[PDB]
């Protein structure tokens, strides 16, 4: 109901609602790395059966899209994909009701503007860093010109393409946020269960779509 801030001053008024959520989801994601696969194997094991399928799926959705230079960007796909869809699990699923932070309201990392705009800016300047080495070092953002219709363009679109995927996740996290909160604000918990599975639908679907979305930006970035 309030998405603005936690009063965690750092000289320049940073939001802690991003901070603690990012910390906890990041921690669970990095700490599932050795549930049973601290000594991995060719023969798949406990955590291996989780992680390797994701890795192969990432290779599927990336090498087709990214291109010949698949390897320098295999972290880029997996981090954003796993982090975002597990954090959407934590945002639409993990409850924090009976204990409330006196400063702000915390359910999700991507709730606040800063989280998703940071991730989007990250992917887009990663596109530009890709174009740095992989395009003419004179013109990388403003290269193309047809019979002139595109004289200020090919950079005006990529000004807002970061803004594109940021707002893409903005509204979609605010979506499940509102859908979860409003029916509980209406009537006790047992009535919205028909559509809590609907709220879980897009929560589970965001994984592959954001993977192929920013991977499509990266496949554009090969050039």
């Amino acid at each position: 109901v309030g998405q603005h801030f936690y009063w965690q001053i750092g000289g320049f008024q940073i939001h802690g609602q991003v901070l603690i959520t990012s910390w906890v989801v990041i921690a669970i994601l990095l700490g599932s790395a050795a549930i049973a696969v601290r000594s991995p194997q060719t023969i798949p094991t406990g955590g291996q059966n989780f992680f390797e399928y994701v890795l192969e799926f990432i290779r599927d959705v990336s090498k087709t899209q990214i291109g010949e230079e698949y390897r320098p960007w295999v972290p880029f796909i997996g981090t954003m994909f796993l982090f975002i869809f597990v954090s959407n699990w934590s945002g639409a699923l993990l409850p924090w009701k009976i204990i409330q932070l006196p400063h702000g309201e915390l359910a999700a990392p991507t709730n606040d503007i800063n989280t998703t705009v940071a991730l989007a800016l990250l992917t887009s300047v990663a596109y530009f860093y890709a174009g740095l080495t992989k395009k003419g070092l004179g013109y990388f953002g403003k290269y193309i010109q047809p019979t002139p219709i595109l004289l200020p363009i090919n950079i005006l679109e990529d000004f807002t393409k970061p803004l594109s995927l940021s707002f893409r996740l903005f509204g979609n996290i605010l979506a499940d946020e509102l859908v979860v909160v409003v029916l509980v604000s209406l009537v006790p918990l047992v009535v919205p269960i028909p559509v809590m599975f609907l709220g879980l639908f897009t929560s589970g679907i965001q994984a592959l779509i954001f993977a192929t979305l920013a991977a499509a930006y990266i496949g554009e970035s090969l050039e």
Binding site: H15, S22, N114
Partner: peptide
């Protein structure tokens, strides 16, 4: 509210990206 909270969190997420990339993706 943009001012610099987004890159302040983005830097730590970048460090996560690279270190997690090592400790998981390389093995």
């Amino acid at each position: 509210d943009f001012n610099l909270t987004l890159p302040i969190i983005m830097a730590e997420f970048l460090f996560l990206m690279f270190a997690l990339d090592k400790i998981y993706y390389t093995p």
